[PDB]
């Protein structure tokens, strides 16, 4: 069987899910209830806004949609978005993360301002491909230049950046896809924090369906998808987090393409056969290593580790606590020296804490030591202390701004941070 995490994922659908006529409150509440039915904790919630067009909707609609999702978490009505957010800072169901999915050409400064106002902590760009040939071929409404610019504006606003990517699009190839993944992790224009990967599928009613019928598009089968994703994972940097390889599309709607439901497991077994190692965040995090391999961090070998890389014109500092003998990731912090910020509260003497993650409670149903956690052991506070030290003593910055989930602001207050516009900030 699978694993129970301490963070509840609540994914909701915006208007043009079907059962609740896209009501934000009913979707959020129904998902929480459903999770409580099966004994999954719901005190910490990652809210995911699905649709990819949300940032293009009227602001009135966005504010209301997020307000009502928070109302369902707060279990009470609110007069406005801002009040629902204030209430949620101390509610029983805290919004610790808010991910908004969007097309890369709907990611202007104005839209980023609005997303920060909503409390967003992560933005998933519908990149699909980094090659303009492929994008025009499939009549996508964005360029690779859109993706690059959006990525930079997001990073320099302190937000986590996720790329949705599709191997096997029309016009592509196995080698071309492999090159795309190498470029995404070694070209500073890209360097995303997360990637969501799934091979391109043929679903009736899409342009891809039209191309497929014309004989223009033969989608990847399992073998091809496995080869590309296995390569991608073998080269993923330690600072990249991947999504569980899966899809919420039932096999009876897939005209052509990968139908089987265990693509992630197939990739894993292929990587074993070929001796391909995976060092990315999902592969090494405590809960996954315990579920997969039955072992726990060896405290004699837990160290603070640091890895730097150039991204979108600036410097990313990836700090982690890690069992370096067994290569197990316990916690990490993303610190950025920004490049060309535009937000009012970001100086040229400002460092950005874009993310702090301590892997916490986790009920591994398939192991005999069931519950395991690593919060309240000091790793988060030690990562923050190191981040402040690096910011002040190495980069000569004078203030540090934290991108904080609504429901996480209380944590940063305990560490001396105060609200600074959309962020939690501290003078160094």
Residue numbers in the entry: 72 to 87, 123 to 534
Paper text:
Elp3 acts as the catalytic subunit, but the loss of any of the six subunits results in hypo-modified U34 tRNAs in yeast, indicating that the complete integrity of the complex is important for its function.
We used full length and truncated versions of purified MinElp3 in crystallization trials and obtained well-diffracting crystals for monomeric MinElp3Δ1–19, MinElp3Δ1–46, and MinElp3Δ1–54. We solved their structures using a poly-alanine model of DmcElp3 via molecular replacement at 1.9 Å, 1.9 Å, and 2.1 Å resolution, respectively. We previously identified a Zn-binding motif in the central linker region between the two domains that is coordinated by three cysteine residues, which are strictly conserved in bacterial and archaeal but missing in eukaryotic Elp3s. In our MinElp3 structures, we could not locate any bound Zn-ions and instead observed the formation of a disulfide bond between C384 and C389. In addition, we observed that the acetyl-CoA blocking loop (aa 466–486) is positioned outside of the acetyl-CoA binding pocket, interacting with the last visible residues of the N-terminus and also contacting a neighboring symmetry mate. Using our DmcElp3-DCA structure as a reference model, we are able to show that acetyl-CoA would also fit seamlessly into the active site of MinElp3, indicating an almost identical ligand coordination and active site organization.
